[PDB]
Ligand SMILES: CCCCCCCCCCCCCCCCCC(=O)OC[C@@H](COP(=O)([O-])OCC[N+](C)(C)C)OC(=O)CCCCCCCCCCCCCCCCC
Ligand SMILES: CCCCCCCCCCCCCCCCCC(=O)OC[C@@H](COP(=O)([O-])OCC[N+](C)(C)C)OC(=O)CCCCCCCCCCCCCCCCC
Ligand SMILES: CCCCCCCCCCCCCCCCCC(=O)OC[C@@H](COP(=O)([O-])OCC[N+](C)(C)C)OC(=O)CCCCCCCCCCCCCCCCC
Ligand SMILES: CCCCCCCCCCCCCCCCCC(=O)OC[C@@H](COP(=O)([O-])OCC[N+](C)(C)C)OC(=O)CCCCCCCCCCCCCCCCC
Ligand SMILES: CCCCCCCCCCCCCCCCCC(=O)OC[C@@H](COP(=O)([O-])OCC[N+](C)(C)C)OC(=O)CCCCCCCCCCCCCCCCC
Ligand SMILES: CCCCCCCCCCCCCCCCCC(=O)OC[C@@H](COP(=O)([O-])OCC[N+](C)(C)C)OC(=O)CCCCCCCCCCCCCCCCC
């Protein structure tokens with residue numbers, strides 16, 4: 001429960017996230033058309049891989065999530081970090097393609113990656 | 124069972140799908156060589172992400188799939204939609220890179236995404 | 247256990263793998279800068295998809311992994327194949343982008359893909 005509770009919710013978000021944004025980018029791509037080209041391309045793949053390792057990591061301490069400890073918060077903020085980070089980006093075809101923005105997204109993937117990873121594993 | 128039954132099968136397909144097609148594209152890429160360049164590149168990533176969110180969504184109502192309701196059919200046709208959709212595409216390096224074809228694939232990802240997602244979640 | 251044991255470990259590796267390598271490439275990309283451009287781009291996506299289907303396949307005989315038979319070894323060497331394969335590659339922006347190296351990585355994905363896939367499925 002506690003467990004299912006966690007994963008679905010994060011992912012659902014995550015997947016409302018990645019979902020609007022995917023078809024959406026598709027939809028805008030053709031609609032914009034071009035700068036928006038990479039913009040859209042761009043959203044997909046950073047995010048697609050935000051998710052891609054989200055998926056690795058979440059999905060797994062998922063079904064290996066024994067300890068009672070509260071860790072979902074990061075499942076939760078890493079989402080929270082990464083969304084506003086893309087969203088912050090968020091149209092500049094010029095590099096920078098990054099910023100404090102992703103010092104948030106990636107780097108939280110990193111922190112919440114790092115701890116929780118190690119956590120349900122070594123236990 | 125009913126459950127395992129579902130996921131493996133869809134994925135197996137899905138993964139026979141994504142699998143021939145991956146090494147295959149590799150194999151053809153070098154063999155064609157060039158137009159086939161993006162063609163192959165092309166197959167991977169639409170499909171790679173067909174799968175990528177397949178994976179998100181399937182995999183999860185997977186292990187959160189309680190209701191008796193018949194929903195696998197779409198696991199099943201969204202595959203059925205997406206394969207023939209790429210396959211329909213399926214060599215034009217000119218945009219369009221889409222069509223009624225993906226009005227099928229993506230959009231079923233969308234429908235079968237949308238309902239089943241919400242379904243085992245809100246329950 | 248035996249099961250959890252398996253998946254986490256492979257993935258952890260896999261995910262220490264894909265993880266250093268992702269932020270890392272990011273980090274080097276900006277730092278190199280350019281040839282390193284595709285190099286880094288390059289690492290991500292072969293590997294990102296090494297993982298991408300790893301994820302499909304591992305993750306699933308994962309929770310459908312009944313037989314006692316020893317199959318983790320490949321979870322294990324396919325990792326072992328693929329790492330040293332990228333790593334072998336591993337800076338040439340000239341094609342070849344492949345070699346005996348990936349005759350290892352991909353092709354083990356293939357062998358260990360192929361058998362274990364079929365195995366916990368048909369059972
Ligand atoms: C609950 C907390 C108690 C107190 C709350 C009070 C907090 C109030 C914060 C007030 C802030 C004051 C504003 C100063 C900021 C100026 C920033 C700036 O100049 O831009 C930098 C710019 C710099 O831009 P740039 O010029 O480098 O590039 C832009 C791109 N070009 C140039 C191509 C156009 O960086 C960004 O754009 C980042 C975007 C920030 C987006 C912020 C929106 C998200 C905020 C989330 C939190 C909000 C509440 C959610 C709560 C939900 C509740 C559960
Ligand atoms: C943008 C900036 C960068 C962002 C990148 C990523 C984010 C980085 C995160 C960094 C780590 C932050 C550290 C916080 C934790 C440190 C505190 C600590 O250790 O104290 C002990 C811990 C543990 O609790 P305790 O140990 O004090 O309690 C003792 C009770 N016994 C021993 C009997 C069990 O305290 C907490 O952290 C509690 C925090 C709870 C969070 C607040 C919400 C609780 C309510 C739940 C529902 C609320 C709705 C929210 C839903 C959100 C919807 C979107
Ligand atoms: C069981 C049902 C009862 C009745 C079955 C009877 C159904 C019989 C349907 C007969 C159809 C009549 C044909 C008219 C169609 C003409 C289409 C056309 O012109 O092409 C559009 C074209 C338009 O092309 P275009 O010109 O825009 O671009 C092509 C690309 N260039 C130009 C670069 C070369 O679009 C497509 O290519 C789509 C490809 C369609 C592929 C169809 C094969 C898959 C069909 C799956 C179902 C088959 C059975 C599976 C059953 C399994 C059983 C469990
Ligand atoms: C290319 C075009 C776009 C494609 C994109 C994606 C596809 C879009 C899908 C859109 C939705 C379609 C709606 C269909 C459902 C609506 C019907 C409905 O609501 O009625 C009630 C529902 C529910 O059943 P019921 O409620 O009528 O039964 C009552 C019994 N009690 C109450 C006691 C439990 O009926 C059905 O849908 C039954 C359909 C079953 C499907 C037919 C096959 C059954 C046999 C199984 C094995 C067959 C082998 C197949 C293997 C395939 C291999 C590849
Ligand atoms: C335990 C076993 C018992 C015996 C152990 C004894 C084994 C000892 C093997 C000794 C080998 C002798 C060396 C001859 C090889 C020459 C290769 C060559 O020329 O390069 C080809 C080259 C050809 O290069 P190229 O010229 O086509 O392209 C390079 C790119 N450019 C040109 C752009 C610069 O291919 C490679 O680079 C492949 C890289 C190989 C990397 C090997 C390191 C990994 C080895 C893993 C095993 C090690 C132990 C791990 C054990 C862990 C324990 C649990
Ligand atoms: C770079 C080159 C390409 C690489 C690409 C991918 C790799 C390709 C792999 C190809 C397949 C290789 C075939 C090997 C198996 C064939 C042998 C066989 O069938 O015999 C019967 C099998 C089965 O056992 P058995 O059937 O003989 O035992 C009988 C006992 N009863 C019947 C009662 C149950 O034997 C084995 O394979 C045992 C091998 C075990 C592996 C050795 C290690 C065991 C110790 C565990 C801990 C060690 C630490 C290691 C951790 C690693 C850390 C990173």
Ligand SMILES: N[C@@H](CCC(=O)N[C@@H](CS)C(=O)NCC(=O)O)C(=O)O
Pocket residue numbers: 042044045046049095097098272275286287290291
């Ligand atoms: N989907 C791509 C995203 C790559 C990307 O957007 N790279 C950014 C940094 S994370 C960059 O600076 N690219 C170089 C460029 O735009 O020229 C991947 O997985 O590699």
Ligand SMILES: N[C@@H](CCC(=O)N[C@@H](CS)C(=O)NCC(=O)O)C(=O)O
Pocket residue numbers: 026029040041044045165167168169172218220221
């Ligand atoms: N793998 C790429 C696929 C992108 C792609 O093929 N985009 C299509 C629409 S879905 C397109 O029209 N691209 C613009 C172009 O080809 O110039 C991604 O995930 O973004």
Ligand SMILES: N[C@@H](CCC(=O)N[C@@H](CS)C(=O)NCC(=O)O)C(=O)O
Pocket residue numbers: 149152163164167168288290291292295341343344
């Ligand atoms: N992430 C890309 C990787 C594609 C790639 O690196 N292709 C290699 C073979 S696996 C190649 O030879 N590309 C053609 C080129 O570099 O011009 C994908 O998923 O398609």
